[PDB]
């Protein structure tokens, strides 16, 4: 029979002492490197209590497979305690992210019909393509202004604005104008608050809420203010749309966006719809933008791969005779390159599931209700699970050797509670990259290795300044 839980290797049983050593040796912002180091110390499985929360950490795709196979109908991941506390104390209506069991399932099913299903997502293409085409126009404009036949700059802020325009366009069916020269300052304030919400989450992460206010008073206050901006503005957007819908009529044969559909025909109350709009808006700005920045970075770092991807896109646009829907079926190397970007640069350091039943992993008995985390960042850099892991190689995902990709594509999670925005995200990034590849060559002057920082979501440790050349 399997060894008991307590035999799983760990730094020890004192959550507070472990937390002390984590902060002193590695730091709150390098949690991803903490995992890498831990697997080097303990082997392919370990357990670690940080503060009051203990998790079993796993890296092997084979163990990942067992975990997700034993998943129940209503999976639970780790809830971020300052987010929970904010919603509870300020009585903020919660969406799919913070719900569980039947209440979660009910929202998820209604939302899948409108954001995941092919019948719905086929409508996103022109809405997303329009925003990407505008982004290209922004860069061409900056090139002309430069007078140099190129443009060099850190475009992270522009990527955030791009991600915002994209998510709002598919939700509201309306352009917010964030790619214009003169921007809406209140919409900019919304974008900034999302980042601030993530950033301020970090100093509170491994603490019960009773300790937040005692030791992180300023951070908690800043965090509360960030969420308040998120909610006040998402509320206004939704409420304005609700009333404008009644002012204009609800007789439309053309596609009007996700919100129109939900308000017009779903099992969701207005309360649930509005809560989920807020979460979709906030979940879609920092995610696709940082991911796309990493993709551009990997293309500049590997010019041969960039050439291959551009050639694939040009051939796809030609064969499809310009049709975007048809193109998206002829660009498998680009799609693989998105998987490759997420393997090296996951947004989420880990995936987590609480066990519903006892489960054996690595001949250790892991009891029901144990939090299990898959160290997705560590997995992506691990040379025993990926050949030459530091190398950006999209063809990796095209192997007929199904062993090479077995439970490796984890950047959007797995199963029924995988990323709700996955289809929006994939479509947005694929279309963005098609437009960029057709229009520009991407380089980085004085290229150097850019590391990663943990700001709740993973992000580049330092700015990346790109150089764009108009492609002929």
């Amino acid at each position: 029979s399997p060894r008991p839980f307590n035999e799983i290797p760990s730094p020890g049983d004192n959550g507070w002492l472990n937390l002390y050593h984590f902060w002193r040796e590695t730091g709150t912002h390098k949690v991803h490197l903490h995992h890498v180091q831990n697997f080097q110390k303990y082997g392919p499985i370990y357990r670690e209590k940080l503060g009051n929360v203990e998790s079993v950490y796993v890296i092997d795709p084979e163990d990942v497979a067992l975990l997700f196979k034993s998943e129940g109908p209503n999976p639970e991941r780790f809830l971020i305690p300052p987010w929970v506390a904010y919603h509870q104390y300020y009585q903020r209506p919660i969406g799919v992210l913070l719900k569980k069991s039947a209440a979660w399932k009910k929202d998820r099913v209604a939302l899948n019909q409108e954001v995941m299903a092919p019948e719905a997502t086929k409508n996103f293409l022109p809405l997303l393509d329009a925003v990407s085409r505008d982004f290209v126009s922004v860069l061409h404009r900056r090139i002309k202004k430069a007078g140099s036949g190129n443009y060099s700059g850190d475009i992270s802020d522009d990527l955030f604005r791009f991600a915002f325009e994209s998510i709002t366009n598919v939700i509201f069916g309306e352009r917010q104008g964030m790619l214009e020269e003169v921007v809406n300052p209140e919409a900019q304030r919304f974008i900034d608050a999302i980042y601030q919400m993530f950033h301020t989450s970090v100093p509170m992460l491994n603490l019960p809420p009773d300790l937040f206010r005692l030791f992180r008073t300023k951070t908690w206050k800043d965090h509360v203010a960030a969420w308040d901006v998120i909610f006040s503005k998402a509320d206004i957007y939704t409420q304005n749309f609700y009333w404008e819908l009644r002012q204009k009529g609800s007789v439309h044969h053309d596609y009007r966006g996700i919100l129109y559909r939900l308000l017009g025909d779903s099992k969701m109350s207005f309360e649930d719809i509005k809560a989920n709009v807020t979460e979709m808006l906030a979940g879609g700005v920092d995610t696709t933008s940082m991911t796309l920045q990493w993709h551009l970075y990997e293309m500049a770092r590997n010019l041969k791969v960039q050439d291959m991807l551009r050639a694939e896109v040009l051939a796809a646009r030609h064969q499809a005779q310009g049709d975007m829907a048809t193109m998206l079926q002829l660009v498998p190397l680009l799609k693989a390159s998105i998987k490759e970007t997420l393997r090296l640069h996951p947004i989420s350091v880990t995936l987590q599931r609480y066990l519903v039943n006892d489960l054996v992993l690595r001949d250790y008995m892991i009891p029901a209700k144990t939090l299990v985390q898959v160290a997705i960042y560590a997995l992506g850099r691990e040379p025993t699970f990926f050949f030459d892991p530091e190398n950006f190689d999209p063809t990796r995902w095209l192997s007929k050797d199904k062993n090479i990709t077995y439970f490796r594509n984890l950047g959007f999670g797995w199963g029924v509670r995988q990323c709700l925005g996955r289809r929006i995200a994939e479509l947005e990034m694929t279309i963005f990259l098609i437009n960029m590849l057709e229009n520009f060559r991407v380089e980085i002057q004085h290229l150097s290795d850019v590391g990663t920082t943990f700001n709740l979501i993973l992000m580049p440790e330092k700015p990346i300044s790109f150089t764009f050349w108009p492609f002929n």
């Binding site: 997700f68 998820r108 899948n112 995941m116 299903a117 439970f407 199963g415 995988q418």
Partner: peptide, 26 residues
Amino acid sequence: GACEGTLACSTCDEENDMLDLALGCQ
């Protein structure tokens, strides 16, 4: 049919990726 016919699980290019991490509804 856990996700209920939306291509958001695998209990029953995009289907190709669900197929790896193992349909009915598609």
